[PDB]
Design a protein around this ligand. Structure first.
Ligand SMILES: Nc1ncnc2c1ncn2[C@@H]1O[C@H](COP(=O)(O)OP(=O)(O)O)[C@@H](O)[C@H]1O
Ligand SMILES: Nc1ncnc2c1ncn2[C@@H]1O[C@H](COP(=O)(O)OP(=O)(O)O)[C@@H](O)[C@H]1O
Ligand SMILES: [Mg+2]
Ligand SMILES: [Mg+2]
Lengths: 236, 236
């Protein structure tokens, strides 16, 4: 009756816009749905610090868990790693609810241009690295395969998507430190870039710096690693 | 060393703006602070339903409780009832944290113009009535007295405020169905006025209808009363 909807897709792809549109159609069909995402909590702090991400994450999972007892939930978050998608499916699993992964995609050119339009809050170079490195959902686990893959440069038919999701809802549900280090070093890089307003060339060197640093680290303690990373950017 | 700051004041008075300014100055002083308010969760649903309010309230308090373990928290909410201020103080008392109530005020005319400015999302006559019936913090209980009273029609010295709060945070800490029905009947009224686009004369009828209704109810369980109120507005 209640379902968990898990969005996944890169920054600028249109997750927030899609969530809002999908929620409006669902509510028009008398479904009680809430849209929840990490940016809810993250943007409630006046500044970003790496040490906030743990509270942001858990607070987000908590609200989803609480919500999914009474309401459909649409999870509006990049969900860049399969371990994130697994953590969310485990919430549905806990309350025996169905779930549907909706993967939104657009070409890199489109994502960059949308980024430029939004005032390049994330550096273009970082979205480009994200796009190159993204493992498309379902590439490894059957439980990770999307219910819908949606091309956000093409027409999207919300009624159809609502219809399919509400059908799915009546079906029977059947069913990492490296990800942390990868994710937080990328966020630190982005903060540094925006904070120090780095020129294009410097942006490139810092993205490369991170790459080389992750090559070394792979060949660990998450905090020690991220602390060394900040120290590295400062030195550099 | 951590503190709960509880805002209180009518719609349009400048809570959310004040919160962002104060969080900025606190963070500039290396304080870890988060701004939380029931609208985070209320605005995450695509429409408003009365049945959501309990979830909203509880989810809000749970985020505050969780946050106050590690961060200063600024509570950005109307906090119209002293019962709401009591619940928030009790979270501070639970963790033995200092708290400060900050009462924000502005004249009715300024509230209306700001309301108009922003599109009259809450009917002006409802603002007027809230202004009329508002009980200023500390009217009855000593634990309810404002640490600070702020006139948002004048400039605000956030440096002084932060200094006063940091000083306060180093001190040793020392420590309802009628409200629900009052609150939700107002929200229902506001939502009918907007959804129905009532003319100004019908608005005043409906406002009076709520007043008359609340009289009769004082002479109960909240769900049934609220369903009847809606039935009354539909009839009327
Ligand atoms: N389907 C779409 N078609 C065209 N533009 C879109 C679409 N969805 C979102 N946008 C635009 O792309 C930008 C990023 O949208 P947003 O929903 O904020 O993406 P995300 O939440 O994935 O970061 C916004 O400017 C939005 O207006
Ligand atoms: N101190 C102030 N002086 C002038 N305008 C203000 C002040 N504080 C807020 N405003 C303006 O008043 C309107 C409502 O402010 P907001 O902070 O959203 O109030 P609240 O959160 O109390 O409803 C906004 O359009 C805002 O820009
Ligand atoms: Mg988004
Ligand atoms: Mg506000």
């Amino acid at each position: 009756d209640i379902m968990l909807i898990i969005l996944t897709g890169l920054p600028g792809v249109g997750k927030s816009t899609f969530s809002k549109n999908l929620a409006k159609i669902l509510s028009k069909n008398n479904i009680d749905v809430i849209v929840l995402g990490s940016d809810l909590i993250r943007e409630s702090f006046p500044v970003w610090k790496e040490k906030y991400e743990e509270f942001i994450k858990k607070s987000t999972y908590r609200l989803i868990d609480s919500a999914l007892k009474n309401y459909w939930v649409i999870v509006d978050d990049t969900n860049y790693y399969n371990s994130m998608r697994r953590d969310l499916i485990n919430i549905a699993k806990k309350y025996n609810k169905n779930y549907a992964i909706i993967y939104l995609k657009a070409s890199l050119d489109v994502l960059i241009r949308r980024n430029i339009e939004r005032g390049e809050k994330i550096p273009n170079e970082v979205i480009k690295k994200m796009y190159e490195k993204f493992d498309e959902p379902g590439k490894k686990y059957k439980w990770d395969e999307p219910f819908l893959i949606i091309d956000t440069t093409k027409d999207i038919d919300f009624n159809e998507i609502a219809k399919k999701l509400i059908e799915k809802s009546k079906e029977i549900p059947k069913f990492n430190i490296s990800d942390k280090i990868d994710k937080e070093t990328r966020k630190i890089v982005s903060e540094y870039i925006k904070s120090k307003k780095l020129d294009k060339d410097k942006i490139k060197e810092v993205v490369e710096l991170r790459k080389e640093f992750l090559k070394k680290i792979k060949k660990v303690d998450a905090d020690r690693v991220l602390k060394e990373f900040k120290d590295l950017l400062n030195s550099y």
